[PDB]
Write a protein that holds these residues in place. Structure first.
Motif, PDB file in Angstrom:
ATOM      1  N   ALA A  43       0.833  -1.196   0.000  1.00  0.00           N
ATOM      2  CA  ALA A  43       0.000   0.000   0.000  1.00  0.00           C
ATOM      3  C   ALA A  43       0.875   1.255   0.000  1.00  0.00           C
ATOM      4  O   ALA A  43       2.003   1.226   0.499  1.00  0.00           O
ATOM      5  N   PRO A  44       0.361   2.358  -0.574  1.00  0.00           N
ATOM      6  CA  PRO A  44       1.107   3.617  -0.689  1.00  0.00           C
ATOM      7  C   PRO A  44       1.750   4.093   0.613  1.00  0.00           C
ATOM      8  O   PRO A  44       2.879   4.577   0.578  1.00  0.00           O
ATOM      9  N   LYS A  45       1.061   3.949   1.743  1.00  0.00           N
ATOM     10  CA  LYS A  45       1.598   4.467   2.998  1.00  0.00           C
ATOM     11  C   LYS A  45       2.826   3.685   3.480  1.00  0.00           C
ATOM     12  O   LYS A  45       3.599   4.190   4.293  1.00  0.00           O
TER      13      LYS A  45
HETATM   14 CL    CL Z   1      -2.091   3.543   1.862  1.00  0.00          CL
END
Ligand code: CL
Ligand code: RET
Ligand code: OLA
Ligand code: OLA
Ligand code: OLA
Ligand code: OLA
Ligand code: OLA
Ligand code: OLA
Ligand code: OLA
Ligand code: CL
Length: 264
Positions: A43-45
């Motif tokens: 995931a992006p984070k």
């Molecule tokens: Cl994310």
């Protein structure tokens, strides 16, 4: 100024150190490809935590490659043993590289601990300052590993103080933020802490080798310790960080992560 320069090496000793460094290169660049391909399932984070493992793989891989070529440059087989020529070999360049790699290892930990914004910036800053204090004092220390063992020890004590304080920051953040972690990685991150304590402690042990084994076999032992430590602290560590990143990604509802873990 380094103990490596003091000795001739048997073909066996010389070739083993060459193989150790070369294997080290191969393992880090093989892992690099793994981290690259799995990054799309993060995931992006958290994705930057996996990117940092790619960065560490190439950084560590390049320093091991450089050491290996320096090793073969510096020694030639003369009158039945490998003897020092015109070019030199030194572990000092490892210390310089740690100035970059150690902050990367620390940052990817903070990311999967779900630290954000102000706390992330402040924690990273203190961690990196502690790490740099450790690396610099240790670098100065090993300049004396031949000339002044006493001085090596005292710089090593100062460096160890930075080391211990750095580890306390790490442990404090891990055991505090453990509860925030998803997908059962609150358990996994505990193993990551102990992996760090184990693997990173191999480096000061290698640093002391000139004090307790000042001979050609000690030179081999130090490279052996570095090899265990590098693979454990960068590769096995990175695999655990990425596992944690993917698992939390899936738990947060990131579909490629869920799909990836579903295939296995
Ligand atoms: Cl994310
Ligand atoms: C990938 C490379 C890593 C994780 C290097 C870590 C290096 C250390 C933990 C170095 C520690 C030292 C001491 C604690 C005292 C002796 C001097 C150092 C710098 C070798
Ligand atoms: C696993 C085998 C490790 C290789 C040993 C190399 C040491 C030597 O051959 O001198
Ligand atoms: C995570 C652990 C990674 C381990 C990496 C090290 C792999 C190879 C280890 C060495 C095996 C022992 C080799 C025998 C040494 C012979 C002595 C010599 O010839 O100088
Ligand atoms: C040599 C290694 C080549 C590696 C190239 C792999 C590209 C990954 C594609 C991607 O996931 O974006
Ligand atoms: C030769 C003097 C060495 C000075 C060591 C400086 C310590 C660095 C501290 C954090 C940056
Ligand atoms: C910042 C910490 C800087 C150094 C603290 C002094 C103790 C170690 C320095 C040893 C100097 C020497 O042995 O000549
Ligand atoms: C003998 C090689 C292994 C040594 C591991 C112990 C050092 C790290 C301890 C925490
Ligand atoms: C002998 C033992 C050597 C250990 C080798 C370590 C290998 C890769 C570690 C992979 C990290 C995966 C995290 C744990 C997975 C899980 O929690 O179920
Ligand atoms: Cl490194």
């Amino acid at each position: 100024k380094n103990i490596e320069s003091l000795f001739d090496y048997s073909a066996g000793q010389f070739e083993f150190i060459d193989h150790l460094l070369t294997m080290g290169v191969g393992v880090h660049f093989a892992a690099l490809i793994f981290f690259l391909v799995v990054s799309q399932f993060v995931a992006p984070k958290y994705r930057i935590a996996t990117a940092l493992s790619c960065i560490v793989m190439v950084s560590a891989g390049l320093i091991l490659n450089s050491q290996a070529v320096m090793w073969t440059d510096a020694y030639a087989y003369v009158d039945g043993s490998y003897q020092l020529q015109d070019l030199t070999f030194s572990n000092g360049y490892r210390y310089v590289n740690w100035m970059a790699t150690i902050p990367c290892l620390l940052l990817q930990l903070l990311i999967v601990l779900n630290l954000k914004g102000k706390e992330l910036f402040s924690t990273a800053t203190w961690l990196i300052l502690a790490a740099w204090g450790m690396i610099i004092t240790g670098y100065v220390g090993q300049l004396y590993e031949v000339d002044d063992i006493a001085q090596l020890m005292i710089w090593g004590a100062v460096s160890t103080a930075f080391f211990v304080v750095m580890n306390w920051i790490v442990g404090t953040k891990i055991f505090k933020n453990r509860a925030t972690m998803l997908g059962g990685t609150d358990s996994t991150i505990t193993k990551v802490f102990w992996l760090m304590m184990f693997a990173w402690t191999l480096y000061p042990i290698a640093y002391l080798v000139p004090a307790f084994m000042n001979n050609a076999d000690g030179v081999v032992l130090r490279q052996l310790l570095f090899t265990i430590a590098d693979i454990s602290s960068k590769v096995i560590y990175g695999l655990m960080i990425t596992y944690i990143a993917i698992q939390q990604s899936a738990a947060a509802g990131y579909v490629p992560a869920q799909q990836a873990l579903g295939r296995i």
